Symmetry: D2
Subunit: 332 residues, 4 copies
């Protein structure tokens, strides 16, 4: 049997032992883990519980809200508040930032996507929860501005993946580690230490249904993945449709994931605060790259908690190849 | 609480009540359900249990065997034998058919894929188990020939999907029904009755990495999905990479799934006995279509338990559109 | 991993293979197993689900009904009906016998106690479900009379024990076997084969709070267990308070369990149909004995589906010792 | 669904919010909760996992060690060390105190019984885990002496009960609260707030098999419980055999539990450090009493980490009644 179980709690406590912190990061992550287990359990039996379907509302980004978006959002909001580790919260499901009541205030600002992969819920395909954590910079009263920090300022970011197994991928200043949920004891156990992405992959991931709207650079790159100029084997294609799933595969298999800007969407579709930045952080800590095609995602200074951003991430050699193409097409 | 739980066992027993059978179909399905729950539990904690990785072997179709292929295969083989409902078994993982020992012989022939979606195991993307059940036709001693029946002879077929939730999709002569696994009591509960696929979808699913090998018909169809000649909205793209996941989404969302024959693979990649036929059966019972591009999958008389077959399935209007293109290109 | 799991279903199917039955016993037990798992799951989280407390009613035997009695009763009634294996049902919670509607009729009569150990529910002490199964003897329309058979006519009996682990103890014509519920896959797995009770134990079990009402024989026996006339070590005492728990310990540890008739209760407290008979059957098949103090429990021909009966059971040498005392005191 | 789950972690963090502690008590309890869930899961499937049986050793108190004692002991020892909240550990299973290595040292001393109720493991009757927590008093290097504190110095104590449901009963300076384990998400949820024991119960709990060794006071009290001098109804008897189970029932139902000193055991059987003191603390915080028959358990200054102590606890009026009897018999 276990007897010496290596949990996310222990792992996090241990590494930050000689950094003598306040300890609230641990409180924060422990809290998030509780909500993640609750979301997982609900998702695992969503049909029997009648949790599929719309809630009857639309969020600021214009998505039709689902029952599971509400359940997961409430779950995350409640546990984060109770953690005594947060002050400002940003969620895809909330029009404005949520200022934590004075009595339960902590030093962290948490941006999160309660349930990523909306279109894949009803078909039982992988979905998840994405988060990014910042330290409140200002001395002012906590406000929405505290969430308007560039991703390079993240102190922690990651995601929960409700796939064939539930995984919690956590990135911090020194690296990325994967923790898998043990359903029997409800604990996230370390399974992959210091994850590093391949320098070059052999899988490209993008929705080719938008081919008519793709810019010449994306068009050229895809054509190149199918018809290699050097006659190497063409890349395989994979597109689950849920950002969390496609990014996770990219992380452990290598390759590239793309949700670029197209002729109808100047800033792409994915949201910078709770989708792009967290994944960008994970990628960089794994030795990968994350760009919009013209600048590093983590360097963007946001002006809107719900603003969108194009994103191309994954193996450094793959991303760089596409950046070279963008630059080749760069028109003044 | 439940109190009146509608299980797969009850559901199956009830419908076939006034058909006064021997009752072994129920025994068969009950047995398969046990193995499916065992596979699901293992998959849900594969990382912690060290179940990821190769087993150190290659099957007849040339796939590198994984630890989970072995575990799932053994699990399925053992429960089916113990069911007293089978005589001949065909598995992707076994070179030859397995003849059930006389003492435990039943009247059914079961073709199955213990674990579908090999490439997606390590990245936690949806995987599953596929099966097709036939009644032994001959009076001869049970043999591999008993598995060489055309899919139109199936009396039952379906699949287990280990996705965000575990689902058991079962098709029989009168229709398709979905049952979701309730982790707490280990029972498959009815969640979707008499499932019917949309006449026309808006999602196409195929690995576009093989574009250089696609025949002109597949090439034309894809181009048509991206650039509609009538200026309707282009179809969205989705390709999880695991047959079971892509087919399931096709079933409940509508649209089309393709794994065609290409310039390097005359008969495509997917196996007819335990991949193509079962899914083809499910599709037809849901009012969908399943073709190779030139003939109906279910009408193919197999000559090899491991033979391959091209497959195009899903919404009738989508499949028909592609068939028209194939016929347009048909060269004598 | 498992791969060759030995379930109650398989075990039952296998032993009765060369007895060529209709197969409905298996259907019956499979059904009962589903309800047992549902009861277990509910019990395991009764506090969180607010399932503790009275329902607001009294049964024929005068017990105050609990929410869990209702939940478990409904669960058992529903699954048994759906099994197509029963015709008459007797439950501690139903005033009169339940005649199964014609369409779902089977040949079995099932007497059951949906939830045994009422006083121990709120304190989280072991509780269970007890059942006894008879074959309908008559040719008449099914009626309450069909349940009025002496326990020696049982073809199957046993109990579910919701203790530190959930166990299903099943006795049939050839012996007793224990099956433990595997929470992960929701299957009862064989753990103890052909259980036999010790010829003589060293534990006596009875509620000594009724000492003022005990007959001289019970009084003498207890005194003898505390002050052995031969100076052997006195028996240890154990009285959980739930029949199922005390009887189970008696079965695997040996010894004796008593709920005798006292000065205020001529027929004791425990009910013959769904408490005494099933346990008496289990005991005898394990090589134990079960008496009222004057006659064998299994030989009593009941006149009331809810009648009570004194019961003394366990190790043959222990029971016989007490019977000798009863006979020593026997007054004409 | 949940969405606002009230866990032991949250509950503990919240109450001690305005006490501005180091926060290690929370770390300690969180750690203990992980081990408790692991023990529970193992216990729930002990038979299938082959965890029943002896380990092949004897502890200082002379008990034959069981496989589950080892598993639970290792589990508790490992999590407590990893908590960074302890310095000295005392376990029924370890001859000497365990001094936590400098690097993982915390300010707490934890006395614990990894698995209580040894005799009841094989029969599936309720078992548990008992603990008592002290703050290191001295300034010296941590040593076994740090565990030799009187129970009145406890800052926290409680127990895990692996019964029909798993409960974590926690007592601290201001009171007792019960938390039930939710198997689905592996979280202890608050179910009973500020538990208080009845002033007078109607159940007595003791092993009457030792009647030949009982002192006159215990003898008189028992006789009085069976034959009330005022003709009130006699108390009911209950004796599960596992301290944790009997004490828990005493707490929520009221009444009295006894494991007195007898003619052959001057100090009774139960151990003061990890059995008597913790339960005594829980009882007092619930408004109950706990005595040896001559002095308060919590006032005893231990001289041996494994010393034994008689114990009588429960409803104040019941305990006081017995104390009066002891005093009536008090011989100089
Ligand atoms: O304990 P505190 O004060 O919350 O902060 C410490 C944390 O900072 C980091 O998130 C920085 O990446 C971790 O290294 C560490 O757990
Ligand atoms: O009970 P038997 O004899 O195994 O066969 C009956 C079965 O045939 C079918 O599979 C035909 O599609 C079901 O309708 C039914 O459960
Ligand atoms: O399959 P049927 O017809 O229901 O009856 C067979 C059963 O009878 C018994 O219950 C007799 O004790 C079992 O031996 C056996 O499973
Ligand atoms: O957080 P620290 O420093 O470990 O100590 C605080 C704790 O002391 C107590 O255990 C005292 O009973 C709790 O009130 C509280 O959680
Ligand atoms: O259907 P599309 O446009 O390809 O969008 C897929 C994206 O939608 C999202 O669900 C966000 O709305 C992401 O998880 C995912 O990558
Ligand atoms: O990588 P490819 O060639 O697109 O193959 C995907 C197919 O491989 C399989 O795993 C079969 O080997 C199917 O589940 C799936 O549809
Ligand atoms: O409290 P008493 O009278 O000892 O009764 C205990 C008996 O009560 C029952 O709950 C039946 O009502 C049995 O499970 C148990 O053996
Ligand atoms: O068998 P006995 O002597 O009554 O002992 C019971 C006691 O034994 C213990 O298991 C301790 O060894 C306690 O849990 C329990 O109360
Ligand atoms: Zn959305
Ligand atoms: Zn998202
Ligand atoms: Zn979202
Ligand atoms: Zn394969
Ligand atoms: Zn496959
Ligand atoms: Zn396969
Ligand atoms: Zn009752
Ligand atoms: Zn009962
Ligand atoms: Zn009852
Ligand atoms: Zn012990
Ligand atoms: Zn103990
Ligand atoms: Zn112990």
């Amino acid at each position: 049997f276990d007897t010496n179980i290596v949990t996310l709690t222990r792992f996090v406590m241990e590494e930050g032992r000689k950094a003598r912190g306040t300890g609230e990061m641990t409180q924060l992550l422990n809290s998030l883990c509780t909500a993640v287990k609750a979301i997982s359990t609900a998702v695992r039996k969503a049909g029997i519980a009648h949790l599929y379907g719309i809630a009857g509302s639309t969020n600021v980004t214009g998505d039709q809200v689902k029952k599971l978006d509400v359940l997961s959002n409430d779950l995350v909001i409640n546990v984060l508040k109770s953690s005594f580790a947060t002050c400002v919260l940003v969620s895809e499901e909330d029009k404005n930032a949520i200022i934590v009541e004075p009595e339960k205030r902590g030093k962290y600002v948490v941006c999160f996507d309660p349930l990523d992969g909306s279109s894949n819920i009803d078909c039982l395909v992988s979905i998840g929860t994405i988060f990014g954590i910042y330290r409140k910079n200002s001395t002012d009263e906590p406000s929405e501005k505290d969430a308007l920090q560039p991703g390079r300022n993240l102190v922690a970011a990651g995601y929960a993946l409700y796939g064939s197994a539930t995984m919690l991928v956590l990135a911090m200043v020194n690296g990325v580690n994967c923790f898998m949920l043990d359903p029997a004891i409800g604990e996230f156990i370390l399974v992959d230490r210091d994850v590093k992405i391949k320098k070059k992959g052999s899988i490209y991931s993008i929705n080719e249904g938008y081919a008519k709207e793709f810019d010449p650079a994306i068009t050229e790159y895809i054509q190149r993945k199918k018809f290699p100029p050097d006659n190497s084997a063409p890349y395989g294609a994979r597109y689950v449709g849920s950002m969390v799933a496609d990014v996770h595969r990219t992380l452990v298999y290598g390759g590239i994931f793309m949700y670029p800007a197209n002729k109808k969407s100047p800033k792409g579709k994915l949201r910078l605060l709770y989708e792009c930045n967290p994944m960008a952080y994970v990628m960089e800590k794994a030795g990968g790259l994350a760009t919009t095609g013209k600048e590093a995602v983590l360097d963007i200074v946001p002006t809107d908690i719900h603003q969108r951003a194009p994103i191309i991430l994954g193996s450094p050699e793959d991303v760089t190849e596409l950046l070279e193409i963008y630059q080749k097409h760069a028109a003044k």
